[PDB]
Structure formats: C-alpha cells, structure tokens
Symmetry: D2
Subunit: 387 residues, 4 copies
Amino acid sequence: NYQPTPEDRFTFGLWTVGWQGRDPFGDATRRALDPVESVRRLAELGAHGVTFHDDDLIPFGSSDSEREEHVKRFRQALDDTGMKVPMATTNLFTHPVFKDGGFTANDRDVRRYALRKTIRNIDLAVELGAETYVAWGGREGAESGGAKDVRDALDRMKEAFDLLGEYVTSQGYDIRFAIEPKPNEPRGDILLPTVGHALAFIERLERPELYGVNPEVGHEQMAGLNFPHGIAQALWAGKLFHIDLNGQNGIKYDQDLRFGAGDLRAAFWLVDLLESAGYSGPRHFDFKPPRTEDFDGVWASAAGCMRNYLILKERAAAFRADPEVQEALRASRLDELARPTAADGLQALLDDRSAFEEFDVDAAAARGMAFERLDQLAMDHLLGARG
Amino acid sequence: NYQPTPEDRFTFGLWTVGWQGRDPFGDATRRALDPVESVRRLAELGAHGVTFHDDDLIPFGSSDSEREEHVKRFRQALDDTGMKVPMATTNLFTHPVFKDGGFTANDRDVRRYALRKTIRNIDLAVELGAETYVAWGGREGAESGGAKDVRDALDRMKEAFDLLGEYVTSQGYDIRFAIEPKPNEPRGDILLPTVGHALAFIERLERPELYGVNPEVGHEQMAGLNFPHGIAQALWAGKLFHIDLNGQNGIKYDQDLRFGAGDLRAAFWLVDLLESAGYSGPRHFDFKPPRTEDFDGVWASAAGCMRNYLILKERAAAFRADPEVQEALRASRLDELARPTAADGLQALLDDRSAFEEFDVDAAAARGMAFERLDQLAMDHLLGARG
Amino acid sequence: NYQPTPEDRFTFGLWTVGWQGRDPFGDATRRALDPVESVRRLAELGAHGVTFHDDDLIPFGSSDSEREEHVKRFRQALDDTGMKVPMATTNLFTHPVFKDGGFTANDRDVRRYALRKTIRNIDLAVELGAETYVAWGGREGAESGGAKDVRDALDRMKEAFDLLGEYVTSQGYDIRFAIEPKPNEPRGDILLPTVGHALAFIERLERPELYGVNPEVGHEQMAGLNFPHGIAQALWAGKLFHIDLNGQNGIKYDQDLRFGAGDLRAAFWLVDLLESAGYSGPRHFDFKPPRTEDFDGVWASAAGCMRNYLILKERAAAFRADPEVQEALRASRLDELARPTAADGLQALLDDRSAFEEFDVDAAAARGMAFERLDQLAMDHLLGARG
Amino acid sequence: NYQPTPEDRFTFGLWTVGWQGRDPFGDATRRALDPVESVRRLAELGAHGVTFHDDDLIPFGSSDSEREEHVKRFRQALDDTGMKVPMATTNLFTHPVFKDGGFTANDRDVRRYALRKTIRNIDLAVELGAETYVAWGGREGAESGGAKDVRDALDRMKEAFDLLGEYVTSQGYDIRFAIEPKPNEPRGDILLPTVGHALAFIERLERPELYGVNPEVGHEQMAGLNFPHGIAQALWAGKLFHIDLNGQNGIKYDQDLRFGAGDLRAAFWLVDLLESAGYSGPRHFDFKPPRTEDFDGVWASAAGCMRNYLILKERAAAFRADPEVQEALRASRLDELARPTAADGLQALLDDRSAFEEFDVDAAAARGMAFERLDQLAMDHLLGARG
Ligand SMILES: [Mg+2]
Ligand SMILES: [Mg+2]
Ligand SMILES: [Mg+2]
Ligand SMILES: [Mg+2]
Ligand SMILES: [Mn+2]
Ligand SMILES: [Mn+2]
Ligand SMILES: [Mn+2]
Ligand SMILES: [Mn+2]
C-alpha cells in the first residue's frame, strides 16, 4: 500500500539512475542511459519529474544544431509522459577546465566561461518549466592553505551569484536559486561547506530573496551534523527551496545511497519535519545505485527511494496522531517551548521576582524531562510495534 | 626570542588554568585556584587580560553581600596588575536546572531565570570594562529527535538575544555579543552547531549589528571543517568579534588542548590569516591543561599557548615576505583571484565572444595551478627550513 | 508483546542505571542509587543479572570490615531475587592516581597497585559467580606523542594480563578475561583502540585461550567502523566472550545511549548476527540514561534497551524465515560465498584454464549482484512493511 | 640541505606520479605516463626504487607476447638506472569483474580468477627482485548488511592467502606478503579495516610467519586512529613489513596527499618512531599529486614527499639528542615505563604491602606527569625554535 504517484512530488536527476558506476578506483559497470529512456522508465515508476545538468542532456561541446536535436527528443518524451522538469543545474565540475573551480577559479577567464555556461542553461531550464536552479560548487575550494584566499574567493562567489540574479531579473524569469552545500569531496575543503554557511552567505547577496538552499541528507552528515536540525533552521529562515534525499553512513566519502539507507532514524525525523511543516517542494533523490547492480537493480533502487519515503510518512503521521504521544509531548513540555519566554516584556521580566530572586532552582532542577518515554514511543511507531 | 607581552593581546579564561581536571570518567586532580592567584600568575606570564563566567568568580548561590566581596578582591588584583577584562560570559550549563538548556529549555520558567542570570552578569562585565559578551549555548539541543521542536527553539533563542540587545541598548552599554558555536557535547546535537549556522541566525535578529561570532579552533574541527576557511567567512561578513584558540585532534570529544597542539598546519594558516587581515581583538585561549599535570604543568601549558602563537606569527610573516613566495603566488594566480570577474558588466559579458564562443577550453584546462610548489614553500617556512 | 524474561539473558551494570548524570560540563542531576535498590528494580523489569566495578559496590578506601558489610547486603539482595552476576570489572580510571593509566602508567608503583586492586576484585567476582572478567583500559594512552612509548606500554600491558592469567590458573578459577576496546576518551588516544587491535594483542599473551573481547556498539562506531563486521570477525576467531550493547550517533564523544538508539539499522544487523550465530553469553547494556531524566526515566530507558532488542530479534527472525528473502540470498549468491574457492587444490587451480586463460571476464562483469532488492527486503522487514 | 639519495630507500608506485587525475566527479587532467619515463624521472630525483600493480605495467587483456614486450622495456629502464623493485601488488579493484571483490566476491568463478591473476604477477615480482608482495583488498566488503556474510568472507579470505602461501613455499620464493588495510572507499565498509584487524587475521593463517602489514598513514587516519600508535603495535608484533607514507586531513575521503601534508605532528612522531626503532624497509609513498597540477607539479609533489621525510628525520634526531629532552623524559618517567612491573613475580607482588595495604595513593596521585613541558620541547624542535 506504498505505491508512489505524481502527487507525491518525487523527482530524480538524470545523473542518478544514469550513473555508470565509475568511482575513484574503478571503471564503469553499466552502459549509459538515453535521457529519453530514463524519462519513460521513471514515469512508469510513478515519479513526478526529472532534473538535469546541462551536460547530462547535451554532450559537452555539442554544436547549437546538435543541442537543439537533443532538447527536442527530450521535450517529446516529457510531453508524451506528462513528466515535469522542476529543477535544473549546471555541470561546473567534470571538465578539466574546472579543476580549480568555476565561479572561484583563480584564473579570471575560467570564471567568465563558467558564468556564460551557466546563463545558457538558465534559458533552457526556464523554457522547460524549472522553478529552481541549483548550484553545487563542487570544485570551489582547495587542498592546501595558500592556494585560495577565501575572502577574495567569497567576493568572486558573491559577484557570480549577483550577476545571475541581475540576469534573471532583467529577463523577467520566474526562477529562484538554491545553493547545495557540501563540506568536502572532490576538493579537500569546499567553500560554503554546510547549510549554515550557505544561509549566511545568501544574506550578503544584493537580492537575497532570490536565493535559498538545496541541502542534501548525506552532505550534512559528512560533517557529523544533524540533518533534521539543519532543515529546521532553513525552514525557520524561509529558505528551504529544494531538498536532496539520499543515505549516508556517517563521516566518510559521499555515498549517495538510496533514501532510507544510512541513518534510518534521521530519515524518520526528516520526514516528520517536512510533512509537519507543510514543505510543498519536490522530494528529489540525488542518489547513486551501487555499481554492484545491473539495470534491474537500478530501477529497484529508485523504487526503494520512493517506497521508504512513503513508509516513513505513514509512521510519522501515526506517531503524531497517537493520543499517547500527544500526552508524552505535554509531559516533556513541548507545548511550553511554543510559548514566548517574556511577552510581558523586558521591564516586567526585570521586575518579576519569581523569575530570579524567588525562583526555586532546585525544585525546577528536580523535574525530569520524560524524554526517554517519548523517544521509545517514537521507536515503537517507526518499527510498527504499537499494538 | 618569543616572549609574550601585553601588546600581543593574549587572554585566558579563569576556567582554563583553573580547570580542576574532572572529566566524564574521573575525579579532580588539582585543587581549585583563587581567581586572584590566577590574575597575578597570568600577569607574570605576559598575558594582557582574563575572562570569566559569572560562576567562576562568584560561587553559585552567593548572597549579594558575598558577591560584592568576591568582586572587590578581584578588582583589587586587576588594579594592582594592570590586567584587563576584555570579555565575560554566563554559565548556563553547569547547574542541573539547565539540564535541557537555558534560553531554549522546554520549561518557560527556566528560560526566564536564564535571562535574569545573564542580565545580572552583563552589568558586572560592563563595570569591569568588557567589550564582548560571549554566549556558548552548551545545553541548547537534544539527544533525541522528539525532545526539541527546533523551529520553536530558534524562536526562543531569537527572543532571548533580542531581549539582551534591548537591555544593553536601553542602558547605553558599549558592549557587543558573540555567539560561540559548538556542534555537540555535552548535548547530542547543539543548536547553531557551526560558525555558519551562527552567522545565519544573527541575520534574523532585530539588531544584527550588535552580534557576531566567537569561533573556537577545536569546535569547528569537531565537525571536520576547515577552521581558517570559517574564520575567513566570518571576517568577510564583518562578524569576527572574538576568537577562541586551542588544539583538537580531529573528530572526537572536545579536547581543548593548548594552542599549537592538534592540527599544526591549520594553526599556521589561522595565524597567517588573522595577522594578514589585521584582526585587532583578543587572542583568547579556551584550553584545559591536561589532568595529568600538576600546577607547574598548568603554567607551562599556558605559556606554551602564547609561545606557539608567536612562533607561528614569525613563520607566517617570513612566508609572506619571501620574494620566492611572492613569485609562487603569482604563478598560482592568487592575484587574478582578487580581480573582478566581470566589472565590465552583464551585457558586456554576454557579448564577449572570448568568454564562451571563442574560449579555448582545452588550452585553459592544460594550465597547471602550481599549488604544490607554493605549498612546499609554506612547509619549508613553517619548519624553518628556508636556507 | 516484547516482554523480557530472565531467559533472554539481559544484564546491566550498576553504573548504568546508577549514573548520577555528571558530565564534563555539569553537576549530577540524580541522587545516588543504593546497589540493593538497583538489583531489585532490575529484577522487577525482567533482567537476568547485574555487573559491577569494585568501586560501584564498595566505596573506594573502605576498610576490610566495611567492605564485607557492603558485600553482605549485596549478596542478600541477589539471594532474595535470584539475580545472577555474570561479569565483573575493576575501576582503574576514576581515582586521580590512575590519571596516567593503571597497567601502563609510567610510574611503576601505580602499575603494581593497579594489579593488586584488580586481583582483589577477581576473588570477589569468582565468589559471586562471574564467568567473565572485563578490562576497560580507559586511562591507558596519551594526549601527546612523547608521553608514552607504546612498545614499552604494550610490554607492560602484556605483563599485567600475563600475571592475571597466572593468578587465575594458580587458583583454579573458572573465569575468562575480556578486553573492552575504545578508541579515545578520556585519553586523547587509548591503547588497543578497536576490536581488531585487541584481538591481535591477545595472540601475544602467554595463555591466549584465557582472553577474548568485550566489544561495545558505541566504541567501534566512534572510529566510524561497522560494528556487525567487527563482531563477525570476533566470532570467527572464537573470541566473543561478552558484548556491550548501547547506541551512538556517529563519530563524537561516547554517548552510551540506550540500545536501539543511534544507528538503528546497525542494531538490526547486529541482532541478526548474534541470533543466527547462536551467541549464548550475556546481552549486557553499558548505557547511561540521559541526565535530562528523573528516576522514572531511568527505568523507562533500561526497559527500552530490552524492548528494542526483542523487537529487532523478531524482525531479523522474520527476515531470515521469509522464503522470498531466501530466494534473494540465492540471487545475490550468498550461498556461493560459503563454497570453498579451490577445494580441488593449488595444482588443480593452476591447471584450470576456465579460471584464467578461458575465463569470460566480460560476461562475469555483466552479472548484477541484486544487492539492492535484498536490502529493500531487509528494510521492509525491519519496518514491519511485509504483509 | 635535505637532498634525497638512494640510501634513503624512498620508493614510489607507478600509479602515484602516474595518476591522471580522474576522480568520482571529473575527467583526467593529465596525460598518461610511460612507465619507462617514470623510472627515469624518479631516478633523477634520487628515489631508491619503484613499485607497480600488474595493470600499471601490462595493459589489462594483453596477450602473452604483448606482455613480454612491456616487461622488456621496463626491465631495460631498471637496468639502465640501477632502480630497484622492492614491492609489487595486484590490481583486483579497477576492472568491473571485481565490483564485488576478488578474494571474497560472492561468485566463486571470480574468486578463482582473482587467485590466478595474483599468482601470475607474483612470478613477475620475484623475477624483478621484489621482497614484499602487497595486498590491498579495496573491493572486499559491502554497502549493505545482507550482501556479505563476513564469517564466510573471512573463510574465503583465509583460503586465498593460505593458497598464496602454499604457492610461494612450493616455488621456494624469497617473498613475504603484506596486507594493506583501509576502513572504507570504494566499498561502504572494507574487510580488515585497520592495522589491528589485519594483525588479528594474520594469526589465523596456516603460515603466519609469511604475512605482515603494509599500513598507510591516511587509511588509519580515516578511522580517526593514531597512526604512530598503530605502527608501534605492528613493530611490537614483528609485522611491519612495509609502510605507505602520505598525508590526510582527518576523517573524509582518501586524499593521498604528499607526505608531510595532512597531520604534520603525526608525521613527526611517525618518523621519530621509525628511525628510533631502526625500521629498514622501504619508505614508500602511496600518494596522488593533486589533479590541479601539471607535470612540473607532479615532480615537485614527489620531491616534496622525500624532502619532508628528511626534514622531519633531522628534527626528531635533534629532539632525541637534546640533553634537555633526555632530562624531561626522565621527569615524565619514560624510563620507569621500561622497567618490568613485577619481575619479582606474582607471589612477591601479592605479599608486597607497599603495593596496596601501605600504598599512599594520595601522594602518588599528586605527582605531576610533566607531559606538557616535554611536548613543548618536542614542538620547539619540530619548528626549529631550539637555539
Ligand atoms: Mg545533491
Ligand atoms: Mg570556547
Ligand atoms: Mg563498556
Ligand atoms: Mg596504499
Ligand atoms: Mn552526495
Ligand atoms: Mn572546546
Ligand atoms: Mn561507551
Ligand atoms: Mn590512500
């Protein structure tokens, strides 16, 4: 009873199911997929849409005439299936010209080329109906301390994004930008390494309302961070424009496992948050079917992403609806956390002797928080052991 | 030739050299230090000032009459030595009443008490001449996913800091706030876990100009992050109000080793940045002399903090002054990174055929970055092997 | 369901439910428990038995007559409840004399005292019926590289365990030793940091048959290692004498969460392994009820340890019993992994042209492993989504 | 100074300086190197010798006659330069047939092929003068818990190494095996993930004397472990047959930076240990010149490997030779750590009242270890600040 449909807003990158399995120590294990084949197979699995890098759809170096042909066959598969393109991005990391970055390469001419490559694909994305344009600065960074003056690099990064915002404003495009953070890999350290750093950077752009974040489960977990907490901060700031769902087993290389794999309880709390907060954007899977798998395994992995989301959504809803959980939340004073600390104001607080001079600190210290009972109720619901 | 003097602006917390050595598995190994003794011994070592938590100087629960006596002896040691108090902070983490937080405790009455405790110590800090008031939210967080609604918690955190800003504004105090991030410990996950998250949070406060960050070497390194990069972002934002220097060996418990220990090359690049950028604030050591040490070892550890900074400052200056390094920086195009990408503007960039239509991507891709020669010159300077 | 009974062999350390909640940054939040109370409360929850450090039972420094009194009360509570004592250990880490270690302290007189303290408690352990004596060398290690010659320290460690083995054999005691590894905390690096290092060390003892490992879920995960894989290697070597179950969220301080929390899927695969291998020793919980909790929360946390084991045991049994899973294990060739590679022998392999000269490597390379289907079946079973 | 010469025993893999720069997210940035060119360039830099995978030298799939041709050219370059081949290994990880492992692939026919591929290259290695044959099981492992029965996989791993040992003994080859551990990447978890796990596994082989370890700096650091401590345990066991030197910044993807980069103080203590223990095997660099570099940068990186070893060797020798350091080692009682704990024997220890009944634990507890003074002396020596 966990069948996905387009209403679930599940999306997949062309580069995900299309990943050929080349890793840093190994050759490809699967043939390349025709973008049109991926569109059709994903439609049959119940996906709502696809996403792409420019270079996933149009082979690097194509003439404008070849470019038009690739875009035409792709659009003809979209129209035939009803599939949507909610997000696009630029590949500024594969070609050797980007070995030191795109927007923050030390060479000025490479930075200008990176901007021209990006702008060209923004035109295409808006044409196909994308609402979000993602930037993953995978090559913006350094292996060594002297190679990059980070204040100058952030000036250049701000310059690039300001120019992109000027471009979409002057064209009158309805599209927003989302920065995808990652702490490391393929560079030793990547600029804007977490959701927090990206959120802070946006506030210094000329038009901050145009920019948000596209956090990825695995990337925050590569810094050991709590992904639901980071998503909560992004929602609190009004900046969760898109999200990348997958799996990661802790601090190591970027695994991009299927969603649900990796940290299972973190996935449960993530789904609880997105659904409770009314997140209405795409549920996008930036994952890689392991290279052990043939093409049947590729489609099983993709179907598993969607299935695990739906199972967790049902368990999260049951948790929140259970009156015993409702009572546990009161016992742990989750409702008091929603109450203003001092809506009576500063003067009243300073005059309030029960807040300090007469506060029974030891009685307050003796109150248990009852967090373990609440968390075991959450366990039981996740495991389907309520009964 | 590495003797510290007050001009080096080295400061120490009372809780650092005063750490008695109680750890999660062990009893104290050293007697408590009288604050007056620490002031005098640190003055003799060449320190510029001390910092304190309220509860380091005034034992928790003291009457206002006892409070005045503790403050009076302390001020009499400050006046006798010329020692400064550039920073103070509140202890909102030791007493059991704070077991679920201060500003974001689920219980509303604890949040009101935490604010009253903080405001009382702001008065004292301004009286003693502190320029910066630090907040380390060590207990703001959770071990389990249901225990804390993080959007509500951030509402409460914003409320607390807004009220503190209203208080200092209405009193006309010349003091600024600095948030000290930490990703975890003693809570399973701490709110505002990195420099980035804290920078982003500040931008949503009512008076953001009043607030900056107090990053700590070890804390960013507990998330595997590059501390010089994070400091560079804070400087770029204009938000580096204070800094905590110490040592950490990677991702594990918060070690608070003496500065220079832990990640030595990261310390070299940190000093290079602070000195090149003209950071003029305190060089504050938030460290703990290991509990293996007696009191001689405590003062050797503190002296070592200051010594390692001065050695690294000399090596960093020699690196930047070396004409061979100056040439290597040009060879790696660090100067081009300082140049605007497109100060000719968007229209000109779009019309510039050399930036895309006629860009020789393969010639540009063949250019080496010469980063390894530069980094070995940096190695040689750090090791004093230039000759 | 999921009610624990004594046959389930669940055990708890006195120091687990007895943890008063003091951590590196905070005071105790709970009063101390009488060991007699812990025995009776744990019996009521359905535990099989209790374990202890010498210092958990007999306050450090007690006279021989005060000692006998505390032992008397404890034994009475055991006799009244039928509760077992399957394991005991020595506290060689809390008292300041052990600040540089016990068995490997640089000071020779401390090492001799450590051995005498341990031997005294071995006698007590055998009296109470313990079959395993655990050693956690929590202070054996260093913060700095010069402080410890690790070759000499391993000589001292081997000497200590060799002397202990000579003592138990000369007494005719039925008791085996188990080393509990941990990578760090409270020392910067701890000797024998993982299951593997401990297994290697045992092979150099004079009587290796007397020694095995006591691995702990959270400790191996503090090095980012796969705990089921490590337990498999210990079982393969015949050295899994005992196990410590708890939860841990990745690489950070030692959290000691209740079992099932932390990494839930790793908990599932661990229980699958222990049950399918027929491990018949204690299921011991080395955990700390979070300091947010009162005593009701302490007992809810302990009961949750046992509940989560029983739920996971049911799910793993259902996984293995599922004919569809048995078919997927065959599709992924798990049964071929148990076939010897070359039971026909070295000469036959060298002459077998189908193993090289005529091996179709491209046809072999194209076979999918079908691991993703198998893993989604395991996911469905864990979540109770089969049926 | 710091000019390397052949007596320094520096060696390099063909695959190190030959790395073309392809990573999981990018194409090659450098052309392929002729192995004959690498031999001659490395000889000019002062290297002692080269190492190789079979597939580095002979393109995979080559006929027997094409094979002999490539070997011929290589041997000519060795004869012309005097360059040694102290070590060789098998590539069991690049070709897609090895996607589930070589020795522990689930498919039995792949395991047999893996053994034949290895045996063919052992013959070549012995011809060229290799004394050590290295095995890095980079594909032995799993991404998911059900995909591999680790007990059966360890049986298959033991079978393979037992067959290899039978082959070399039946041929009368003078060659020993060394296992290279790695915790993860490219598999989610790799079997025998650390030095300790590998040492334990060797003790269960039929001919343990034939097998040792080839530890790599970066791999142990990828588990957050102390690499000098691990090397000390391997030396203590008589199993350090070979070593891989490089640099790594903490827990993340396998960086393979040049030696000295990464964790500089750990590099210092490593060199101190190897030189003071008299390790006389190859100083092998398993590193990757960053893909930002052209071929000038490739040779600068390789030369930097050797330079940094020689600088650190000089500093550690000066540290150990310093009378003031010798006095500090005595103050910290390093000499007492080498004294047997109880050479008077078990009976004497039990009767010695000064070891327990009359031991002044409080006086012992008050002794400082003086570790911070000793470590600052080591810091001064590393930085060249003594004198
Ligand atoms: Mg992504
Ligand atoms: Mg601090
Ligand atoms: Mg334990
Ligand atoms: Mg290697
Ligand atoms: Mn990823
Ligand atoms: Mn700290
Ligand atoms: Mn633990
Ligand atoms: Mn490596």
